[PDB]
Amino acid sequence: KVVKNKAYFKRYQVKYRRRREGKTDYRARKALILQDKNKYNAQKLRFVVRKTNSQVICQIACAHIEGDKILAEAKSKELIRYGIPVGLKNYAAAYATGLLCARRFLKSLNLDTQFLGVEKVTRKPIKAFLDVGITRTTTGNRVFAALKGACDGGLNIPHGNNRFPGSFNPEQLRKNILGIHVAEYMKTLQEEDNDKYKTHFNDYLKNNIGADDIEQMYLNAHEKIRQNPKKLNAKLRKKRVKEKLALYVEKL
């Protein structure tokens, strides 16, 4: 038999477009968006962190029946203007995107002087809730890196220590948000074999980014960013198909 029968096509029910594309969830989404109906105008702003295979994006989203509205946006590719010309998928890159997003959103809402955030590494503030983005939120993930960066920027999102590196390692959290592990990998790879080190970090070596330079470079970037924000119609279809039939009369 054939499972691709016309009856099967007739009975098929299409999925939602986003679910078919695999972009969304439509259970976490509705749980995130819906708020208690007892309260009114509760927008329940959602922070959105999406990691591509190249760079991450951080947005602030509000809900509507007409559709989601985006208030503030940040890409990983803005770190060049802040001193980071390479490695925009990095853990520190995600942290910087989160801090950039938080600072721009606060400035645009005019609460910069009212929320200074925190310093370096260890009325109620405005609220946001973190997007999962399908990706399995295991311990030590770039999404939670950006979450910590936003919280340090001045946002408030309820988060535990379970998926922060360690189960709790503040030293490793500092190292990851500062890029220390990248430096250690550079050290180990350089010691073990120079060939692999150069063929891997060719661009880092091109820009001459030393191992003991990454952490200070990211720290300087963080301080700077904190102090400064064609078609065919029916007639042609019939014409061309009748021509195709005329050719197939004597073609094969």
């Binding site: 029910q13 939602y16 439509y26 259970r27 989404r29 509705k30 968006i33 819906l34 208690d36 109906k37 007892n38 009114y40 809900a63 509507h64 029946i65």
Partner: protein, 155 residues
């Protein structure tokens, strides 16, 4: 002999064709106010917070709102009289109505028209027209388009 909760809903509560799967992810986002008029539609994808057998399709008004519950007042007939009944349902099943959007549009039109009408001091038959007898007029038709009719034979 049997009068259980969901009795006789083999088709009524059944989701319509090619409409299976969870409720639309935007139905949660409707805005409700005390005094609004609302319709009750029993969906089956959601299970808890469910309306009952009789109330499917009825109307009412919003008088009670909780974290997720909505209490609606309905007039249900019983023999010789009508008695108010308060039913608590959930947001998935409840649905904003249209029974008053006509009257709301009429009120908005009144507000935006009779204002200028009063400004000019004109009286209008602002009551709904209910068009009855058409007027009498003259029309044209050439003799080249009059097609006669005649009863048909049998076969």
């Amino acid at each position: 002999k049997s009068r259980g909760k969901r009795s006789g809903t083999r088709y009524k509560f059944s989701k319509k064709f090619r409409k299976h799967g969870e409720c639309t992810a935007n139905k949660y986002l409707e805005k409700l106010n005390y005094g609004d008029y609302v319709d009750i539609v029993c969906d089956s994808t959601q299970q808890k917070g469910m309306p009952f057998n009789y109330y499917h399709g009825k109307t009412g008004k919003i008088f009670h709102i909780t974290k997720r519950g909505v209490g609606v007042l309905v007039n249900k007939r019983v023999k010789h009289r009508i008695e108010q009944k308060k039913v608590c349902v959930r947001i998935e099943h409840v649905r904003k109505s249209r029974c008053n959007e006509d009257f709301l549009l009429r009120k908005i039109k009144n507000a935006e028209l009779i204002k200028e009408a009063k400004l000019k001091n004109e009286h209008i038959n602002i009551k709904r027209k209910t068009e009855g007898p058409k007027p009498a007029a003259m029309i044209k038709v050439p003799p080249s388009k009059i097609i006669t009719i005649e009863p048909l034979p049998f076969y």
